[PDB]
Chain length 186, copies 4
């Protein structure tokens, strides 16, 4: 048994000039409408020619409290990142929210340097802005005409990276261990 | 058992810097990942802080054939519309597709006129464009400062209606029976 | 050469950078507008703010609607013949157009070609399209899966939806008959 | 004289099923099209029923260098913020780009505390995420039913703020001087 909010379902129905009465075999109460499982809701979605996802758009409960959400150091997800055989990053999630799933804010420790081989990613859809909280960071990316570029970012410097530009952050000084903040969004 | 496409789920996981390994309680094959029901996929969504709807976005099978979908006169949904005892419209769905659930294209017969009372709707989120295929149509709507407006649209005339502007289409002549095409979108 | 920009709007752009009019010294203004000596001047201000020039005009065009609506009349607006490789294919008549949705292009078309003339598919387009047949019998052809050419026939009151970038052609099924369709591109 | 890129103008013209030939008295080159001033381009835009802004979309030269843009500490705009006589913030712009004018990344020094009066902003359209680089930060905001809320954010904590929620960041301790990073976006 799968419940869908009644007002929401009625709104979808109204996009097709319909009402609950035009659905075959559904029970409902004053706030919900009930389906005999996912296959049943899938069939109703085909009947309305609306993809299944729409039946859930907006229907997840907000994880904010009073318009805001707070996270604490080490309070959430954390993970090492190893590329080819090279320890490259420690990813720590900052605050994350279902009210903007495209926002991924991270604190990273950098573990590689010039003595290890380069491990560029393939770029990604998200824009990114990085701020250096500590140390000295070697940044490398693939620029115009596939030519490799590099620079060095010191504490308090920052960088914006256009979507799908491949990039790497490493320690400028080998054995030193820098920290950056990275916000992907939009 | 609920299957989610593997490449899609892996893409969502990557927006959180995760991989299948960070969900330990899931089986998978070369193209799908399997959940013990909706409650299970809902828990994984809360863990990822991504709303459930995202796990279905794009995952409904397209109802198009070779990039296109065709509908036939009288082939689909059709309904009379009666407002406070007044026969106002016949709604006939034109082609509808799950590849744009926000598109509602209609053919309407108009059945009311000046001898019946006015039955405006409450407006709606969709933009609308209407084209008169046949006859002469009295259009009325609520304009600036809630003042009622009216005009007449002849064959081949058209009108654009901003979202949430309440409106009514009726026969200008009375006993004459006009036809319009109405496209709500976006 | 003088370029006016709405003052409230410019001030809102300035506030996205934590600035005020005072951080641009070389500008005259009234209670509602701010004036630039020319485009090069506004361009420099845009560079200084790291905001593209287009933003200075976003939202600033006066609505062409009257009381939330806009009406167009048969033959009241733009109209044009479409000839493809020497083949007279379409007559395009604009239905209502509005600056409040520039991506909405609603057309009435006459079809002038048929099976005796060569095929003239377009290259497809970004817009979604829905077509409704007002009159006659219409041969529709498009490029489907694996670049295979597809075809069908649409009668009066039939309709079709076309996914973005699917190449397509509408012609007369019968030949010498002359059909009419309504085509709405949007989004 | 206003020049507009020719390929671009042609693409706009094609959205209206037009070509350069349908425009009255315009000169052009192999790459540009020329207008007798803004009023002229404004009239062409009314004729096409396309807002003026569209004629410049994409037409500003990117301020990125090879897909990236770098800013240095103290390299760009910087300003003190005083609210009703109270020194509240030092705003330092981090990297800014014309490729995303909705991104405003700041480094702030906090100068106020509990001994000074509260100076909330009015909120803003942008979402915000804040990360505490140094110290201990008193955050206050207006939540549900206009009730004032407060909390304390330590080094490495972060917060997400929904659009138009009014807020203030100040020093928790008093005479201590904290630092935050604040990213408004989207
Ligand atoms: C800081 C980098 O942008 C992180 P990656 O995208 O390679 O995970
Ligand atoms: C043609 C009209 O827009 C139909 P309604 O929205 O009242 O169903
Ligand atoms: C009816 C067709 O969509 C018109 P085209 O897009 O080829 O100009
Ligand atoms: C860090 C805060 O969000 C700065 P404000 O938006 O009041 O200028
Ligand atoms: Mn990255
Ligand atoms: Mn309507
Ligand atoms: Mn087309
Ligand atoms: Mn703020």
């Amino acid at each position: 048994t799968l419940a869908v909010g009644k007002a929401h379902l009625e709104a979808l129905l109204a996009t097709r000039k319909m009402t609950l009465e035009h659905l075959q075999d559904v029970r409902h109460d004053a706030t919900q409408v009930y389906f005999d499982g996912l296959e049943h809701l899938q069939n109703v979605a085909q009947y309305l020619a609306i993809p299944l996802s729409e039946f859930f758009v907006g229907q997840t409960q907000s994880d904010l409290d009073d318009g805001v959400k707070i996270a604490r150091r080490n309070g959430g997800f954390k993970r090492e990142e190893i590329r080819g055989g090279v320890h490259y990053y420690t990813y720590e999630h900052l605050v994350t929210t279902n009210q903007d799933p495209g926002l991924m804010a991270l604190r990273l420790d950098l573990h590689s340097d010039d003595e290890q081989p380069l491990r560029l990613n393939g770029g990604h859809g998200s824009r990114e802005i990085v701020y250096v909280t500590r140390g000295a960071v070697r940044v490398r990316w693939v620029g115009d005409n596939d030519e490799l570029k590099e620079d060095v970012l010191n504490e308090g410097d920052s960088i914006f990276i256009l979507p799908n530009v491949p990039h790497s952050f490493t320690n400028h000084v080998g054995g030193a261990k820098s920290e950056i903040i990275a916000i992907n969004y939009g």
